[PDB]
Amino acid sequence: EMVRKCDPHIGLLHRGTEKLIEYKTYLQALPYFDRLDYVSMMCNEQAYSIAVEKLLNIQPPPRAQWIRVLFGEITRILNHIMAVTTHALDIGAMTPFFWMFEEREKMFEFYERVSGARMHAAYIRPGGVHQDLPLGLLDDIYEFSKNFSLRIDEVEEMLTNNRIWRNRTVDIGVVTAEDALNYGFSGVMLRGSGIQWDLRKTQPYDVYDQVEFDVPIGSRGDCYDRYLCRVEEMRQSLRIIEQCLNKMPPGEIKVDDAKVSPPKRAEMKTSMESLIHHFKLYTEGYQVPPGATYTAIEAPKGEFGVYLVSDGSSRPYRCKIKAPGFAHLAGLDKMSKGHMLADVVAIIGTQDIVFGEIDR
Amino acid sequence: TYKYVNKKEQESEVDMKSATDNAARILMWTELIRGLGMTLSYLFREPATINYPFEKGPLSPRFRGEHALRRYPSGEERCIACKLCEAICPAQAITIEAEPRADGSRRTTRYDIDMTKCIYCGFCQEACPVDAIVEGPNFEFSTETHEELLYNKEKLLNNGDKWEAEIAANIQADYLYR
Amino acid sequence: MFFINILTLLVPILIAMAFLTLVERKILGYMQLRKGPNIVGPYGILQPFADAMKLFMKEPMRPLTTSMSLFIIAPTLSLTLALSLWVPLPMPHPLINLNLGILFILATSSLSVYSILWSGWASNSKYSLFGALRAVAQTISYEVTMAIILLSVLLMNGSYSLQTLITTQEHMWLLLPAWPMAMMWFISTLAETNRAPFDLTEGESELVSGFNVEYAAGPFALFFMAEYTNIILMNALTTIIFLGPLYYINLPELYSTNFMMEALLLSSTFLWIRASYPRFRYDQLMHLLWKNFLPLTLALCMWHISLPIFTAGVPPYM
Amino acid sequence: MELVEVLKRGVQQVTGHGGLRGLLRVFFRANDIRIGTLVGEDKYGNKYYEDNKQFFGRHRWVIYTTEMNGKNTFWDVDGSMVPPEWHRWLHCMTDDP
Amino acid sequence: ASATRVIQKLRNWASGQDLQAKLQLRYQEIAKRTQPPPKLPVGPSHKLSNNYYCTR
Amino acid sequence: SRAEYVVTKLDDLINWARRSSLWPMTFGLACCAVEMMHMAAPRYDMDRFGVVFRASPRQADVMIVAGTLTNKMAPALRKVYDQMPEPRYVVSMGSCANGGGYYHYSYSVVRGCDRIVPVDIYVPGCPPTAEALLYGILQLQRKIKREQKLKIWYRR
Amino acid sequence: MNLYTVIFINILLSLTLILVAFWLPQMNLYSEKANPYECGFDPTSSARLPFSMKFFLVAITFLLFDLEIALLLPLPWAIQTIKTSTMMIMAFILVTILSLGLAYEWTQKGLEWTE
Amino acid sequence: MWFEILPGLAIMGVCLVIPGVSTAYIHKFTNGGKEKRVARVQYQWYLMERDRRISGVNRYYVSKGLEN
Amino acid sequence: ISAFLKNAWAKEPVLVVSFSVWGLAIIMPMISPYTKYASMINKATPYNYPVPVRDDGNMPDVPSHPQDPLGPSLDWLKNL
Ligand SMILES: CCCCCCCCCCCCCCCCCC(=O)OC[C@H](COP(=O)(O)OCCN)OC(=O)CCCCCCCCCCCCCCCCC
Ligand code: SF4
Ligand code: SF4
Ligand code: SF4
Numbered sequence A: 001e002m003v004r005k006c007d008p009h010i011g012l013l014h015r016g017t018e019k020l021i022e023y024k025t026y027l028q029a030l031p032y033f034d035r036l037d038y039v040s041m042m043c044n045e046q047a048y049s050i051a052v053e054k055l056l057n058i059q060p061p062p063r064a065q066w067i068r069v070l071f072g073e074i075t076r077i078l079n080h081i082m083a084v085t086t087h088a089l090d091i092g093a094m095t096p097f098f099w100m101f102e103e104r105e106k107m108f109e110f111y112e113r114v115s116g117a118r119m120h121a122a123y124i125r126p127g128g129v130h131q132d133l134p135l136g137l138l139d140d141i142y143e144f145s146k147n148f149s150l151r152i153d154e155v156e157e158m159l160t161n162n163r164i165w166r167n168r169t170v171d172i173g174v175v176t177a178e179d180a181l182n183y184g185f186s187g188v189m190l191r192g193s194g195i196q197w198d199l200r201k202t203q204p205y206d207v208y209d210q211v212e213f214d215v216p217i218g219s220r221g222d223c224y225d226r227y228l229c230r231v232e233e234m235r236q237s238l239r240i241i242e243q244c245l246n247k248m249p250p251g252e253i254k255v256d257d258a259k260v261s262p263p264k265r266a267e268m269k270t271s272m273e274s275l276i277h278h279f280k281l282y283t284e285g286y287q288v289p290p291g292a293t294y295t296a297i298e299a300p301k302g303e304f305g306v307y308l309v310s311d312g313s314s315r316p317y318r319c320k321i322k323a324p325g326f327a328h329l330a331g332l333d334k335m336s337k338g339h340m341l342a343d344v345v346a347i348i349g350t351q352d353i354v355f356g357e358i359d360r
Numbered sequence B: 001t002y003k004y005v006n007k008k009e010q011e012s013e014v015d016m017k018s019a020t021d022n023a024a025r026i027l028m029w030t031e032l033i034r035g036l037g038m039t040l041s042y043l044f045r046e047p048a049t050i051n052y053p054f055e056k057g058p059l060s061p062r063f064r065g066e067h068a069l070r071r072y073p074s075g076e077e078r079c080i081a082c083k084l085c086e087a088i089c090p091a092q093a094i095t096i097e098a099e100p101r102a103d104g105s106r107r108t109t110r111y112d113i114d115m116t117k118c119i120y121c122g123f124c125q126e127a128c129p130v131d132a133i134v135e136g137p138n139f140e141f142s143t144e145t146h147e148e149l150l151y152n153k154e155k156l157l158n159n160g161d162k163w164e165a166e167i168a169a170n171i172q173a174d175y176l177y178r
Numbered sequence C: 001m002f003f004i005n006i007l008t009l010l011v012p013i014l015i016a017m018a019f020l021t022l023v024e025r026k027i028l029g030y031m032q033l034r035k036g037p038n039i040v041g042p043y044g045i046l047q048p049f050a051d052a053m054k055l056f057m058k059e060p061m062r063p064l065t066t067s068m069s070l071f072i073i074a075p076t077l078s079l080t081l082a083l084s085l086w087v088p089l090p091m092p093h094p095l096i097n098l099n100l101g102i103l104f105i106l107a108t109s110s111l112s113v114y115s116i117l118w119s120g121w122a123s124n125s126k127y128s129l130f131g132a133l134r135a136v137a138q139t140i141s142y143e144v145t146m147a148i149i150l151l152s153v154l155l156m157n158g159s160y161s162l163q164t165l166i167t168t169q170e171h172m173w174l175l176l177p178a179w180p181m182a183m184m185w186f187i188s189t190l191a192e193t194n195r196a197p198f199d200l201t202e203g204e205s206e207l208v209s210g211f212n213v214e215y216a217a218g219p220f221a222l223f224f225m226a227e228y229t230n231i232i233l234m235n236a237l238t239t240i241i242f243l244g245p246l247y248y249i250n251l252p253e254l255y256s257t258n259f260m261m262e263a264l265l266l267s268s269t270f271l272w273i274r275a276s277y278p279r280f281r282y283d284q285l286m287h288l289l290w291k292n293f294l295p296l297t298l299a300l301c302m303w304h305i306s307l308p309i310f311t312a313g314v315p316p317y318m
Numbered sequence D: 001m002e003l004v005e006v007l008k009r010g011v012q013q014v015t016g017h018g019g020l021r022g023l024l025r026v027f028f029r030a031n032d033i034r035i036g037t038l039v040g041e042d043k044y045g046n047k048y049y050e051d052n053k054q055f056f057g058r059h060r061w062v063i064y065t066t067e068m069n070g071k072n073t074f075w076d077v078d079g080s081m082v083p084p085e086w087h088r089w090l091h092c093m094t095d096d097p
Numbered sequence E: 001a002s003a004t005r006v007i008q009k010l011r012n013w014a015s016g017q018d019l020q021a022k023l024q025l026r027y028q029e030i031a032k033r034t035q036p037p038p039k040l041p042v043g044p045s046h047k048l049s050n051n052y053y054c055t056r
Numbered sequence F: 001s002r003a004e005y006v007v008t009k010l011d012d013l014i015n016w017a018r019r020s021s022l023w024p025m026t027f028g029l030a031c032c033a034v035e036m037m038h039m040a041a042p043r044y045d046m047d048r049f050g051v052v053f054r055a056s057p058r059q060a061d062v063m064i065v066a067g068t069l070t071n072k073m074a075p076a077l078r079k080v081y082d083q084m085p086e087p088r089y090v091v092s093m094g095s096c097a098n099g100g101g102y103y104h105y106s107y108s109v110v111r112g113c114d115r116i117v118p119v120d121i122y123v124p125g126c127p128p129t130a131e132a133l134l135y136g137i138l139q140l141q142r143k144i145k146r147e148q149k150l151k152i153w154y155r156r
Numbered sequence G: 001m002n003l004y005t006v007i008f009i010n011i012l013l014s015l016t017l018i019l020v021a022f023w024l025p026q027m028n029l030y031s032e033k034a035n036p037y038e039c040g041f042d043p044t045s046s047a048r049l050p051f052s053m054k055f056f057l058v059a060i061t062f063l064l065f066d067l068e069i070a071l072l073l074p075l076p077w078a079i080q081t082i083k084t085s086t087m088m089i090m091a092f093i094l095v096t097i098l099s100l101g102l103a104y105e106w107t108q109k110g111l112e113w114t115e
Numbered sequence H: 001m002w003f004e005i006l007p008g009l010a011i012m013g014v015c016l017v018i019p020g021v022s023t024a025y026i027h028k029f030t031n032g033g034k035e036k037r038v039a040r041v042q043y044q045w046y047l048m049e050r051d052r053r054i055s056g057v058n059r060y061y062v063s064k065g066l067e068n
Numbered sequence I: 001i002s003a004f005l006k007n008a009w010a011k012e013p014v015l016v017v018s019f020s021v022w023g024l025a026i027i028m029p030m031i032s033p034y035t036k037y038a039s040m041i042n043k044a045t046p047y048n049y050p051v052p053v054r055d056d057g058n059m060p061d062v063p064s065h066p067q068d069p070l071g072p073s074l075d076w077l078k079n080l
Helices: A017-023 A030-036 A041-056 A062-091 A095-114 A138-159 A164-169 A177-183 A225-246 A272-283 A326-335 A341-350 B016-025 B030-043 B123-127 B153-174 C002-031 C047-057 C068-084 C101-122 C126-154 C164-168 C180-194 C218-241 C252-276 C284-291 C293-310 D003-014 D020-030 D084-090 E007-015 F003-020 F032-040 F074-083 F130-145 F150-154 G002-023 G056-072 G086-107 H002-032 H042-055 I002-010 I013-031 I034-044
Strands: A215-217 A292-298 A303-309 A318-322 B002-004 B067-069 B094-100 B106-114 B133-135 F062-066 F089-093 F121-123
Touching: A017 A030, A017 A318, A030 A041, A041 A062, A041 A292, A041 A303, A062 A095, A062 A138, A062 A164, A062 A225, A062 A341, A095 A138, A095 B030, A095 F032, A138 A225, A138 B030, A164 A341, A177 A326, A215 A225, A272 B123, A326 A341, B016 B030, B016 I002, B016 I013, B030 C002, B030 C252, B030 E007, B067 B153, B106 B153, B123 B133, B133 B153, B153 D084, C002 C047, C002 C218, C002 C252, C002 G002, C002 H002, C047 C218, C047 F003, C047 G002, C068 C101, C068 C218, C068 G002, C101 C126, C101 C218, C126 C180, C126 C284, C126 C293, C126 G056, C164 C218, C180 C218, C180 C252, C180 C284, C180 C293, C218 C252, C218 G002, C252 H002, C284 C293, C293 G086, C293 I013, C293 I034, F003 F130, F003 F150, F032 F062, F032 F130, F062 F074, F089 F130, F121 F130, G056 G086, G086 I013, I002 I013, I013 I034
Parallel strands: A215 B002, F062 F089, F089 F121
Antiparallel strands: A292 A303, A303 A318, B067 B133, B094 B106
């Protein structure tokens, strides 16, 4: 009942999203990113949007960036709830799941009030953001955030000082820093081994330089350290939501350049220029210049990356998507050495694993 | 800035009191009675569940669900076969085939939506220049046949004539944002 | 009239199993911030009957790789032992007055293991065999401690008869003399019956329903109700041994009522424990139940041998 | 004390649906008794009650009919029978029935 | 909100901390569902003068 | 009174049993499974209806295809559907499984689970709200309620 | 015969129940449903092959400790003897010997599993 | 709410109470206003076999007294 | 060694309890005065008939009847 070799045969959520993206426009291709990592939706489309903005040499405005980082941290709390509670289900503890999926339902209500979809909101666009958030929503995010600390404290009371959780996560999945770097890990799988690295700090992409928070780092590369790191990332995302609420400046939410981002619905019904631009944007696209980029963000799993290749056309020529989870699964066999089937189950749960990005 | 989560500041201070406290943590499962008490607290709370068919989940006007083809207040058909709802549809769900109507009007002879290809993205309704096709509130249109979920002009117009009393209100609420 | 007695002992135990399933689901629900079944009956008091009927209408699975004899015979044995264990139980006057009741219980349970352990082999598959070997490890872990705990506890009762514990506890409980033995007995009853956190044989996230992955219908139902019957049995044993209720020779139904109360409390405690904690590992269970429970168990057995003597408290042989 | 007051509230719940017939007609049919304010009755039979002292999934609810279009929905109930005028208020897109 | 003041005590003791103030549910402290209409603002490049697309 | 009436009421009973206790499978492939979890979650609790998961397909009465079905994962789906013991039902959940969905025209996608398993009920969405999946499950209950098997057996 | 009767009753309950479970329902058998599970895919080999057990030493010492139980279990009758010193010393010796053996196994890493 | 669990608990308790009171009353009914005799040693069995052979009817539970 | 036991009461307190209870079980029988009444009580129990004895004419200390003064007065078992 102990493992001598692991050969993950992924390929069962391989659809061909990259080829379909080559066949679609830059706006048509956006929901694929919502659908790749399907518990951290807005972060994937944030990455895509940043890449296309870089190719366009265009920046979004302050308000759009602020609500973008706000919903990025909301996605972090989503996926960390997901990862922690699924890891616990695997290990046997099932009550955090039901305690926290109510909070996830509230978060989905935020998504459905902002967009009209609980999960696959195509809200982060290349040119800023689609739709301005409604009256009376920051109050609700505040009312949620003031109590989520109590919720996460309940979970932490259940299964941090426990003996079964400790005995079942500690000295499990131990990774050296050199092994992590060479195998290609990112995010929490680095910070658990003790590598001070976070792109929100080193390569800030929307407003993260303008907002303060701390990066949890672990001293042992066991599962317990990179469980507490996720818990503290949830707390720090809450700390950042506080700031993003306290400053959310007024102004346009999308780039005021109607050759990239579509105009107002009434502006396209009194002006001919903006109607032409509506037409071409919503039928042809906006013709990003040639070139290429690699842009990466801290997805809640790690370094979600997109290598776009372009041309004068309104479509992309290549879009590879780096999946944090690809390299983690590659390192699965290394991390499970002298361990058992149950400990391997825990190691699967620890990587924050999801296969829409891996297979894609 | 960073911070350690599981790094002891320093060790090597123990007396018989701390030993007693640790040995009573052990041998009494004291950190497990806390979990028992937590689950006991949750037994005496109001559960978050709802009697679904009789009381339901909260939605917003922006919610995007079943589709519909709308009309003007005069009853005139509002689509004009500008054929860009299918240009942008990233699933290739929409087809149009259009002709003059014998009144001398740009109108459709076809408006199909394979709702088994639709991803419910809203691009069609934010691309239509006349607010003709919308994505309404109905999420309770499950079927026992694949062929029922392949719609045409008549089904979409039935939806519109059904859900206009809701869609008009949702649009009235959500415009000034779109 | 003995057959009517069999009825009054057997059918209510089966209804108790059936409604324990409901109570489990609803308690776990409310701990999980939800309402369990409240639809099929008024408050869901028909879901067990629905489950049973639906299970007995499903087509049973006779695989090709299987050994059909052991396959069909293991659930039979499981329920038969789960239902024969209730026989000597004094509540307060038993159905069958044995002089070595605790040995009957011990042997019956050590044989109840073989249901799991032959169903898993007969069901020729991998996760099935994993569940079987995990059952072997579990029994290796718990049987020694169960026996020596029970010895130390009855070493102040004077006999293996279950009915003598009622007079041993006429003015007190055996929980205050032996709360440590009671702790370890509780957790060994938790390791027995394959109940969480010591489940480790239908460990749905480690194994895909071990020793039942190939069982579908009424056979699986038999395993189910055997488990949920042994739960109530072990709670009844804990409350007959340690939580001794009041006999009152004129009022024996009082004994029966307090027995009911304490058994329900301890069963709800099992469900509570399922809801609260994660699962052990079947090697960590060995390490626990050999390197923590067996030392203290032997030490306290020495103590309980000394104690009748240096206190002049040697009990009577009837 | 307060135990007696919650028992009184339960007595009111038991005794605010007509009688035994009217109580069972709601209890076997919706698995709830909670009394609220009648917002309005529909042109098919639906009732659309309300009680804002509850939380934000139960402050509004429906009690369906027993015959909508010759279908006998006394037992076979479905959410497709809420027309759009009340769909909007029931799914909480409005505070305006 | 309705916990009869002794079950409130039980749950606040077993938990470890006051949770009647920080509840999992929502009663009246939420942004209500029908709202006033907005007037969304208008970004720069609406200058009406000294704004040519070749410059920005 | 009549044998046919007795048969009708017996069938009502067996349908009530199979309807009030249908045990789905832990079989979710893609995003739609997250909304299945949310249905399992407190707000739209499934166990309220007698709908609790079981991991083995032999202790299961229904399978919910909550995700995209690929050419590499179709044999496994069919093995699982086969291993399920009859009476058994299927719920296709999401556009990716009703039809091919957003991945209809791709090389590694089957354009509907209709081609591999027989579907009883189709739930649309990308994703379908767990509210909607719950509606579809109750619609499957209603479908079981009108099976009329022993009736037709008597009429053979 | 009372006990024989109770056990026969339980036996016949179980067998009647299995008879019902098998001959009441409907059957649609075919080779693709009657073959072992292995999670959707097919097995790569048989399950009637060696499963290396890594706690065999623990199993054997469990057997010896079972015998120790069998020796300790006469104590409730051994206590009503007149001596009450020989039995004390001998039970002390037995338990202490068992504990010594457990300690030797523990220190020699017999309770650890064969990785 | 949590008081919606008390029905199932009540059925469970009413079902667990019956095996005891039922056994007690069946014993008293067959043996007759008397607890069912325990015979743990051969002496008690001797007493019961005796009382059987005293009765005139093969029943150990008639309790002939000082009318002889 | 006091420091060693101080360390072991924190780390591994299960074996400390075990050795303590073992030594206590061995030492406490040596201490008590009630330890000797156990054999005497086990002896007092008459599981078998006290067979009478023939009057040789030289049995003064042996009683002629159950409730005579002679023989072992079991009043030490009373009010123990
Ligand atoms: C007069 C002088 C003589 C007196 C002599 C008496 C001296 C005092 C004796 C006290 C001894 C009490 C018994 C303690 C046994 C447990 C031993 C122990 O150390 O805990 C075992 C286990 C270890 O946990 P761990 O943190 O890993 O430490 C081990 C490091 N080697 O930890 C565990 O077991 C936890 C895993 C099991 C979890 C199961 C869930 C438990 C839930 C609690 C329910 C409690 C209800 C009990 C009610 C019983 C009623 C019958
Ligand atoms: S975009 Fe609107 S008007 Fe144009 S074809 Fe589509 S529905 Fe008709
Ligand atoms: S919502 Fe999106 S996928 Fe669906 S029909 Fe409209 S454009 Fe196509
Ligand atoms: S239909 Fe949409 S939500 Fe469902 S699996 Fe496909 S992409 Fe994901």
